Design a protein around this motif. Sequence first.
Motif, short mmCIF file in Angstrom:
data_model
loop_
_atom_site.label_atom_id
_atom_site.label_comp_id
_atom_site.label_asym_id
_atom_site.label_seq_id
_atom_site.Cartn_x
_atom_site.Cartn_y
_atom_site.Cartn_z
N UNK A 158 1.34 -3.70 -11.72
CA UNK A 158 1.43 -3.26 -10.14
C UNK A 158 0.11 -4.02 -9.53
N UNK A 159 0.40 -4.94 -8.62
CA UNK A 159 -0.71 -5.60 -7.75
C UNK A 159 -0.49 -5.29 -6.21
N UNK A 160 -1.50 -4.85 -5.53
CA UNK A 160 -1.41 -4.56 -4.21
C UNK A 160 -1.61 -5.55 -3.41
N UNK A 161 -0.74 -5.66 -2.63
CA UNK A 161 -0.99 -7.09 -1.60
C UNK A 161 -0.20 -6.36 -0.13
N UNK A 162 -1.10 -6.66 0.87
CA UNK A 162 -0.98 -6.24 2.23
C UNK A 162 -0.33 -7.17 3.03
N UNK A 163 -0.04 -8.28 2.72
CA UNK A 163 0.54 -9.43 3.20
C UNK A 163 2.06 -9.06 3.50
N UNK A 164 2.81 -8.65 2.43
CA UNK A 164 4.17 -7.94 2.72
C UNK A 164 3.94 -6.69 3.38
N UNK A 165 5.26 -6.12 3.84
CA UNK A 165 5.39 -4.79 4.26
C UNK A 165 4.90 -3.81 3.44
N UNK A 166 4.47 -2.84 3.90
CA UNK A 166 3.88 -1.79 3.16
C UNK A 166 5.03 -0.74 2.35
N UNK A 167 6.13 -0.91 2.96
CA UNK A 167 7.33 -0.06 2.23
C UNK A 167 8.24 -1.11 1.72
N UNK A 202 0.77 -1.20 -0.05
CA UNK A 202 -0.14 0.09 -0.05
C UNK A 202 0.93 1.33 0.04
N UNK A 203 1.89 1.48 0.87
CA UNK A 203 2.87 2.36 0.87
C UNK A 203 3.52 2.73 -0.47
N UNK A 204 3.97 1.72 -1.10
CA UNK A 204 4.64 1.98 -2.47
C UNK A 204 3.50 2.48 -3.63
N UNK A 205 2.25 1.90 -3.56
CA UNK A 205 1.29 2.44 -4.21
C UNK A 205 1.13 4.00 -4.01
N UNK A 206 1.03 4.22 -2.65
CA UNK A 206 0.78 5.65 -2.24
C UNK A 206 1.88 6.59 -2.76
N UNK A 207 3.15 6.15 -2.74
CA UNK A 207 4.39 6.88 -3.04
C UNK A 207 4.28 6.93 -4.64
N UNK A 208 3.86 5.95 -5.30
CA UNK A 208 3.76 6.31 -6.89
C UNK A 208 2.68 7.13 -7.06
N UNK A 209 1.48 7.11 -6.40
CA UNK A 209 0.30 8.07 -6.63
C UNK A 209 0.97 9.69 -6.19
N UNK A 210 1.69 9.69 -5.27
CA UNK A 210 2.24 11.04 -4.89
C UNK A 210 3.38 11.37 -5.86
N UNK A 211 3.96 10.76 -6.68
CA UNK A 211 4.97 11.16 -7.47
C UNK A 211 4.63 11.95 -8.52
N UNK A 212 5.45 12.94 -8.70
CA UNK A 212 4.67 14.26 -9.63
C UNK A 212 4.99 13.72 -11.35
N UNK A 213 5.79 12.71 -11.38
CA UNK A 213 5.82 12.21 -12.52
C UNK A 213 4.74 11.40 -13.19
N UNK A 214 3.83 10.90 -12.30
CA UNK A 214 2.70 10.19 -12.44
C UNK A 214 1.31 10.87 -12.42
N UNK A 215 1.43 12.38 -11.52
CA UNK A 215 0.22 13.07 -11.40
C UNK A 215 0.15 14.09 -12.70
N UNK A 216 1.25 14.78 -12.83
CA UNK A 216 1.09 15.83 -13.97
C UNK A 216 1.01 15.33 -15.37
N UNK A 217 0.12 15.67 -16.07
CA UNK A 217 -0.49 14.99 -17.27
C UNK A 217 0.82 15.12 -18.25
#
Lengths: 327, 55, 55, 44
Positions: free
Chosen positions: A154-163, A115-130
Motif C-alpha cells: 500500500x503506497x499513498x499518493x495524492x496525485x491520483x483521485x482520492x477514491x 488517501x480516501x482508499x487508505x481511510x476506507x481501509x482503516x475504517x474497515x472492521x476487518x482491519x480494526x478488530x484484532x
Amino acid sequence: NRRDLRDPDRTVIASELVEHSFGVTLDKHVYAALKFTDEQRTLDIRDYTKQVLMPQVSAVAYELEDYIAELIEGAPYEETILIDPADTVPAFITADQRMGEANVPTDSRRLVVGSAVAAALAKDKQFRHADWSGDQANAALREAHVGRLAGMNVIRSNAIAPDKAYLWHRTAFILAYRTPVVPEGAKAGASFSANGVALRWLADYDYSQLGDRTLLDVFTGRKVVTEVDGSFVRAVELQLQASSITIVGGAFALATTTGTKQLKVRDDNGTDVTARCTFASSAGTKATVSAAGLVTGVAAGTADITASYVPPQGGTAKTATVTVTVP
Amino acid sequence: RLVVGSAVAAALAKDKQFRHADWSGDQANAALREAHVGRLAGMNVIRSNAIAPDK
Amino acid sequence: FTGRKVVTEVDGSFVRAVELQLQASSITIVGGAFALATTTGTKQLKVRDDNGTDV
Amino acid sequence: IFVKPELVAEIGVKQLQREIVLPGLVWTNPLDTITVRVPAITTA
C-alpha cells in the motif's frame, strides 16, 4: 489441434505463428521558462539558487508527477471493481482474481492507493478488530497505517483521485526520458537533476529585450503496454463507490446580497466530487448558480440549490438540496 | 487431489470462515495478508486456470 | 497418441471423484447502461453472476 | 533531413500464457489397447 486416430480425413492441418510488435516514441517536451527583466534582476532576486533554481526544479518535478498521473488513468481500463465503503477486502480479492484470470504474474505488482482508499481501509472492521485482523498490535487503532493487504504493498499518493486505486504489473507502462544536449553555441549551463532524471538548464542574455531568460527542459515519452487484441489486462483500477452525497458547510447565507460563493459537495466516503457534480437552482431568479457550483447572489431572499451526482456503480443520480439565504 | 478454479479460490478467500482471524484460528490471517487459502479440509488446495473458475 | 478413460465402478456409478459448484444468486450486465457504438454498430454484451466468473 | 535506420527491441515483454499444473496429477500409463483387471470380492 486435436486429431482423431485411425480416421484420416483432416490430414496435417498445420498451424503458424505471427510475432507482434508495438512502437514507443518520445512526444512531449517538458519545459519551464523564466524571463527576468534584468532591471528587476538587479534588485529583486537575492539568491539565484534558492528562489529561482529550486522553484523551477520543483515545478518540473511536479509536472513530471502529473504526467505520470494522467498516464496512469489514461489507459483502456475495463472494470472499476466498485469497492464497498463498509467491506473493502472483497474488492481487493476480486481484483487479485481478475489479475490471476489474465495470467498476470504475481511478482512485482505495484499497488498505489489514494488517501480516501487508505481511510476506507482503516475504517474497515476487518482491519480494526484484532480478532478479525490477527495482529495483536492493532495498527489500525494505534496508528493510521494499514500494511500489507492481499499480497500487495500500500503506497499513498495524492496525485491520483482520492477514491481511486491502481494495481499494475511491473511491465505495464513504458516511460522514456531524454536529457537535451547542451548546444555548442550558447552559454554553459548546469546538470540539475530531479528525482533521477536529469534536466537541461539553458540561460541566455537577450540584448534586444535587455533581459536574461532561462529554460529548464527535458524530453519525455509515454506508452501503455496492451495486448495484441487491444485488451489492457496488465492493470486493474479500483473505485470507491459512493452511496450518499452532501454539500459541505450545511446551511449558509452567502457573503452579501451581491456576492459569490464557491459551493463544494462531498460524498459519504469523504472525497471531493465538485468537478463531476451538476448543480440546479429551483429559484434561479432569486439565486444564480454556475456550472462549477459558484452560486452568485443576484436577489436577496431565500432559495434552494440541488446538487446531483452520478454514482460510480450506476443507476439514479444521488441528489442533495441545500437552502441559501442571500442577504 | 483437490483442484479449484479462480472463482472458487476467490470465494474461499472471501469466506468468513477463513477471513476472520478469530474464526480462522490462525494468527497469521493469510486471507487478509498474502492471498492463499492453504490446507483446506483433509487435503491441500491446487489453483489451476485451465479448468472452469466456477467449478 | 493419447487415450482418455474414466475409471467408474462395476455398478455403473462414478463414486471415485466429486465435483463442487458455486451457487449463483443474481446476475448483472457489465457497464450498466450504455449507448452502443453508433446507430449501425455492434456491441458484445457480457454479464456477471455476482461471484466473479463469466457466465 | 537525415535518413535513419529502424530499431526493433525486446525487453521483458512476454505474452501471457497458461500454467502447466494439471499434468502430473493423473495416472498416466504407457502404451492397441490396455486392459486393467478388476479383482473380485466374495461374500460370506
